[PDB]
Amino acid sequence: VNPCCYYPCQHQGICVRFGLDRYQCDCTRTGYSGPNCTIPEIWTWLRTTLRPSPSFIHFLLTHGRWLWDFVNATFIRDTLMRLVLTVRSNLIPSPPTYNIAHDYISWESFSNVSYYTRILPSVPRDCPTPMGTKGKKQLPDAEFLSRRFLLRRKFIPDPQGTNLMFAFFAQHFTHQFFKTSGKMGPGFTKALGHGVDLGHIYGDNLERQYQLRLFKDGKLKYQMLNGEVYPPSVEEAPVLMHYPRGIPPQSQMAVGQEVFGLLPGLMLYATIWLREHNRVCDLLKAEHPTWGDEQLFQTARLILIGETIKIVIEEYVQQLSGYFLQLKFDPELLFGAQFQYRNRIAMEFNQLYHWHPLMPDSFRVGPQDYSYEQFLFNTSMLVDYGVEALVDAFSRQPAGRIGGGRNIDHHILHVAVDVIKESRVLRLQPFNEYRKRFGMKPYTSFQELTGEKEMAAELEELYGDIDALEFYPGLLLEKCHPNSIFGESMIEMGAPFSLKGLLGNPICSPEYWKASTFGGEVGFNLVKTATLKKLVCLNTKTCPYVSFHVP
Amino acid sequence: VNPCCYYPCQHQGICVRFGLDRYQCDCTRTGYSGPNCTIPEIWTWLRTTLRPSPSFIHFLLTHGRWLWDFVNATFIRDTLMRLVLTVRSNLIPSPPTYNIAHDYISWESFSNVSYYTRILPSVPRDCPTPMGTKGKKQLPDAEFLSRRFLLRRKFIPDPQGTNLMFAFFAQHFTHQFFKTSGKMGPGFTKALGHGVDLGHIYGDNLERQYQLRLFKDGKLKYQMLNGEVYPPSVEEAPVLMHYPRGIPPQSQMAVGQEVFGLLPGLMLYATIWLREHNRVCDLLKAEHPTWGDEQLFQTARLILIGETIKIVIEEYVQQLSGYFLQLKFDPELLFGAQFQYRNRIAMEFNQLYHWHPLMPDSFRVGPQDYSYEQFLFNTSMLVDYGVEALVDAFSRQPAGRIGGGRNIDHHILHVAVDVIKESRVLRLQPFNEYRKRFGMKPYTSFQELTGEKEMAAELEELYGDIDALEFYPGLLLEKCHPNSIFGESMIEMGAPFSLKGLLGNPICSPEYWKASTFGGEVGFNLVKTATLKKLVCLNTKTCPYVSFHVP
Numbered sequence A, B: 001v002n003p004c005c006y007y008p009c010q011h012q013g014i015c016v017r018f019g020l021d022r023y024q025c026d027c028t029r030t031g032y033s034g035p036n037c038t039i040p041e042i043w044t045w046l047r048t049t050l051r052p053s054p055s056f057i058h059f060l061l062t063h064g065r066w067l068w069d070f071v072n073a074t075f076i077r078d079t080l081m082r083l084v085l086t087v088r089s090n091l092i093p094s095p096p097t098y099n100i101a102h103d104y105i106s107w108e109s110f111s112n113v114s115y116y117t118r119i120l121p122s123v124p125r126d127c128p129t130p131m132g133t134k135g136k137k138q139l140p141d142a143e144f145l146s147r148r149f150l151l152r153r154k155f156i157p158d159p160q161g162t163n164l165m166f167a168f169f170a171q172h173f174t175h176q177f178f179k180t181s182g183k184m185g186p187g188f189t190k191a192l193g194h195g196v197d198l199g200h201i202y203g204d205n206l207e208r209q210y211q212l213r214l215f216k217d218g219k220l221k222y223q224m225l226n227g228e229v230y231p232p233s234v235e236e237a238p239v240l241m242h243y244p245r246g247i248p249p250q251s252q253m254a255v256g257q258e259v260f261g262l263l264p265g266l267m268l269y270a271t272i273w274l275r276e277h278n279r280v281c282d283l284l285k286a287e288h289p290t291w292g293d294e295q296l297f298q299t300a301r302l303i304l305i306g307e308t309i310k311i312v313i314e315e316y317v318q319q320l321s322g323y324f325l326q327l328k329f330d331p332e333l334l335f336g337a338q339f340q341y342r343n344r345i346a347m348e349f350n351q352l353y354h355w356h357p358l359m360p361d362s363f364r365v366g367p368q369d370y371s372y373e374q375f376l377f378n379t380s381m382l383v384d385y386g387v388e389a390l391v392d393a394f395s396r397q398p399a400g401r402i403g404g405g406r407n408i409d410h411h412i413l414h415v416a417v418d419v420i421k422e423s424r425v426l427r428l429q430p431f432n433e434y435r436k437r438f439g440m441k442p443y444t445s446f447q448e449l450t451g452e453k454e455m456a457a458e459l460e461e462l463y464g465d466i467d468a469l470e471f472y473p474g475l476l477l478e479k480c481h482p483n484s485i486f487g488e489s490m491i492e493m494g495a496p497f498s499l500k501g502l503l504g505n506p507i508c509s510p511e512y513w514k515a516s517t518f519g520g521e522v523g524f525n526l527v528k529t530a531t532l533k534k535l536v537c538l539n540t541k542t543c544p545y546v547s548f549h550v551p
């Protein structure tokens, strides 16, 4: 049997096969020696024997508001943050390593950008069981597993206060770097860019950007409806969109992310940003009468990438974590560090981010309470209500807890079924292995993963071994932190991929982080002071309650 | 007039335009302050007031063989080298900055890999003269300039001892990262990869690699002629090659770099590497009976990339420089440094590397002395003579000096004409500006550039200003160092682009520099001990005189 199915090599050592029955662990620079990379170095030993749990820490960061307030005002706000940045990032390899096709380093992996990368190689196709050595030869029926432990029975709202404004924000932002090529199969992405390139606004390819562009003042095309600015129609900007058969071009808004037409929340955010891009164009032209379309356009896009990275980090993250520590977005905290301004979307990351439980049972817009069947392909709700109305609405309605179990609405429960299935095609390693990869202790029993006995008992008879518990289910069934949106793993696997992905954008490099990159101090400050409220309000007649937190 | 035409901003500060008549220099992190980035910081001041000339240094490195021998044996061989690596590289920006289309940072520049990048933005299209502010409104006729100062009158052999083996090596290796898209125009490359990806062996695209591949044991296809291994025929591997009309497929060797069929030297090296790739496949399979085609193939290619980087660095560079200091290729000297494992071929670099003077007057193969007209599209010379014969020949025949003037053979003198012309389309800045970019003092007169009065006097009446002397001519007409192949600028602009380009390959990163990346200690050592002699000799029945130095 393939010795590597035993996952012999610890601490990131690489299991290389040799001969017909041998294997060797490459423990290069792992901090351990030995046949399985298990004997630590004196420093490695200390470093770990002194690492307080991710649990201990999540305690502190969510406690002592008073003590934090002070720290937040001291220089220490930078110091911590930096540490977080450096440390968190180390967990993610760069340049990237494996892909659906190669469980080894290779020029093709490194250069063929159509593949999502992956942190751990697949479960060798020649192992006894689907997960390697443990568990049953057959895995739990995805469908069943989904109805038993993920089907929302009673809506559990998120204790942190997260609202649909955040939910839709997350949905929008993620679909600019998560864009699986249905034509190529799982493992393949259409979002070459692998990051915050804002391609969900400008298009994932030149042709499409040129379609969406006004080619005047750096402006993005658009249309006026009710005296308000909205994305142009597919008639004006003949771009490919995914609207159900039967809807005319003149009723479809062209936007960049073909999929965005199937949900007002999505098309709401697409409108705020289009508005914002054209707004910045004006600020620029005023300053640089000499510039042309391209430069106004290119510089506009760099300012928005910056805005996005800031909001995404100081308001979007902040809310999620729940910490008292003022996460500061400052590309300079990294200038002294050894960091690689490069990123590549990992398949693990596309999964761990599939937070469908967030969606509510119905969508309340004032006295009006719309059903999924009334929300889903509603070409009229946005123009009808207008930005402000929806922004206030989503900002007020709570979104559901993400971790815990049985909280995904039946309407989209199929998506979770597909995710589990894809996981298997991708041949992802077991949850417990990823635990270790991200520096955590693997679970010893189902009752420790879930904080109880009922589900644990059944997961046990389904999986057989805790060491056979799959990635996604493991992520959504594990116990939440105190009054959290989710638990450990999400966070300990989530932030890494999720910070490296941001700080690793080229604009955060010393080479690009210059006022001139943004057209001068004005563009630069736009970036430096971006804010959710400013983003909405500087682009709306009135300024509604706008937050990632429910009032 | 465009204020930026005056190249106002010093020390890499960025000239941003404002209003109709203003401009601002972005001196961010330049080490200088002031409206033009001219007032240094106390440290910057010291650092430069104490920098011994590139001339002073090139003296030392080429002198004191005895003192060097010791240093070479001390730990200092690493220490220096490191310094060279770090320092040299800093001169080159990463992530990349401008391109033919954008004289500003931009997402498109950063992501559209079809463009060659450039270190200095173009000469604004709205400047008084072609070079900005100085010189004449009309530039010297390329053709004339070429016949007057570059046309080889009497063959000047290179004083360093360089032979055609080196010449062809340079030619081969460069055409894997220099591959201008004739269909797209100047500024565009077909070599996405921008570096040592060995695509001149495997193809610049998947389709073509699959054509060249045996799909057995990781082997590359091939054919036996005279009991010897040679690249397959276009009949066997239906791949696109550039052979003159009238030559049948059965007489064309398919190789990866379409252009390689027009010169035995080129097809000589293509044969040595194909041989080498298949040789390593065997070493691998033996070790890993369990592996398949892909993995043998992928791992083979990583070993060759490594071999190439080593030879290219310890034998190929060493020869050029002329230094006594043992350049050591060790990716680890950089593990402590802040380095970006990323590269992008600059247009300046495609020019500065256009060393056509190297080619001799005739090609001597034993008693036989072939003319260009007998060498150029000679489909039979390689199979006729075989690897060894040619390798001995080229290793024995000296190549001509590269710097100095009037040493390019008439047969290919057109190429220099085109280079000067392309330079102008690309709107490259003046030679003197690049001097400064790469930390050198700009020339004050033509007589200082050339080491004399005759050519200097005429270049002067042609250009008008030394500050209008173009890049390429400036590079090939400047005075050579003592008994050197070329001079300062070549070297002070050459090594940077040329080292960053190597150490910046992903395999040199801590992430990939592991024995497992190469299939174990065996592949790893193959890399670690690669050598020109081993490369040829382990792939030939007999081992001829093989060197980059003439006997």
Ligand code: HEM
Binding pocket: A167, A168, A170, A171, A172, A174, A175, A178, A179, A180, A263, A350, A353, A354, A355, A356, A358, A359, A412, A414, A415, A418
């Ligand atoms: C109205 C509620 C929502 C609906 C209709 C929905 C539906 C879907 C569907 C159909 C898939 C594709 C997989 C498949 O079923 O074949 C998907 C993928 C995705 N969704 Fe949603 N989703 C919702 C909200 C969100 C939210 C709030 C997030 C959280 C950011 C999110 C994250 C994801 C991710 C990461 C993917 C993968 C993207 C890719 O594979 O390219 N979705 N969603």
Ligand code: HEM
Binding pocket: B167, B168, B170, B171, B172, B174, B175, B178, B179, B180, B263, B350, B351, B353, B354, B355, B356, B358, B359, B412, B414, B415, B418
């Ligand atoms: C038998 C002698 C040689 C011939 C026939 C030759 C010919 C050419 C020609 C035709 C061009 C293209 C530009 C044009 O004319 O439109 C070219 C480009 C090039 N050659 Fe050679 N060359 C020779 C040797 C070499 C050598 C020894 C080097 C040095 C490495 C070299 C370096 C270059 C470079 C850098 C380019 C640009 C590649 C690109 O634009 O893609 N060539 N050569």
Ligand SMILES: *[C@@H]1O[C@H](CO)[C@@H](O[C@@H]2O[C@H](CO)[C@@H](O)[C@H](O)[C@H]2NC(C)=O)[C@H](O)[C@H]1NC(C)=O
Binding pocket: A112, A113, A114, A115, A183, A184, A185, B205, B206, B207
């Ligand atoms: C990136 O990798 C994918 C997968 O190898 C390549 O796509 C396949 O390429 C081969 C040869 O062109 C085809 O036979 C397959 O049908 C292709 N598609 C799929 C979905 O496998 C793709 O060509 C590579 N892209 C680049 C730019 O190298």
Ligand SMILES: *[C@@H]1O[C@H](CO)[C@@H](O[C@@H]2O[C@H](CO)[C@@H](O)[C@H](O)[C@H]2NC(C)=O)[C@H](O)[C@H]1NC(C)=O
Binding pocket: A205, A206, A207, B112, B113, B114, B115, B183, B184, B185
């Ligand atoms: C990279 O940039 C080049 C130049 O912009 C793009 O090529 C041009 O693209 C437009 C739109 O497709 C065409 O009208 C031109 O004819 C294209 N060719 C040339 C030579 O200009 C190219 O499409 C870009 N590539 C990517 C992958 O973005």
Ligand SMILES: COc1ccc2c(c1)c(CC(=O)O)c(C)n2C(=O)c1ccc(I)cc1
Binding pocket: A081, A084, A085, A088, A316, A317, A320, A321, A327, A352, A353, A490, A491, A493, A494, A495, A496, A498, A499
């Ligand atoms: C201050 O830097 C950051 C930046 C982002 C961070 C965090 C810290 C933390 C916690 C921490 O690292 O402190 C989480 C929760 N983050 C996320 O945005 C996240 C990403 C993906 C997923 I799935 C879940 C969460």
Ligand SMILES: COc1ccc2c(c1)c(CC(=O)O)c(C)n2C(=O)c1ccc(I)cc1
Binding pocket: B081, B084, B085, B088, B316, B317, B320, B321, B327, B352, B353, B490, B491, B493, B494, B495, B496, B498, B499
């Ligand atoms: C030890 O690291 C290196 C590596 C490469 C080096 C050098 C040093 C030097 C000199 C130096 O930097 O010491 C030159 C001459 N190099 C070149 O290969 C070169 C590249 C392009 C061109 I055009 C001309 C020369």
Ligand SMILES: *[C@@H]1O[C@H](CO)[C@@H](O)[C@H](O)[C@H]1NC(C)=O
Binding pocket: A006, A007, A008, A034, A035, A036, A038
């Ligand atoms: C290495 O791991 C394998 C598989 O778990 C195990 O059988 C072997 O005993 C281990 N060797 C050591 C020294 O831990």
Ligand SMILES: *[C@@H]1O[C@H](CO)[C@@H](O)[C@H](O)[C@H]1NC(C)=O
Binding pocket: A373, A374, A375, A378, A379, A380, A381, A382, A384, A385
């Ligand atoms: C779309 O939303 C509007 C509210 O703006 C509602 O009146 C309309 O009925 C919805 N359309 C569908 C098909 O549910």
Ligand SMILES: *[C@@H]1O[C@H](CO)[C@@H](O)[C@H](O)[C@H]1NC(C)=O
Binding pocket: B006, B007, B008, B034, B035, B036, B038
């Ligand atoms: C800046 O450079 C411009 C153009 O060379 C020059 O006219 C001006 O005097 C300079 N200003 C200073 C303070 O050097």
Ligand SMILES: *[C@@H]1O[C@H](CO)[C@@H](O)[C@H](O)[C@H]1NC(C)=O
Binding pocket: B373, B374, B375, B378, B379, B380, B381, B382, B384, B385
């Ligand atoms: C090709 O080279 C051979 C020497 O191997 C020579 O005899 C032959 O004439 C050459 N062909 C041409 C067309 O010059």
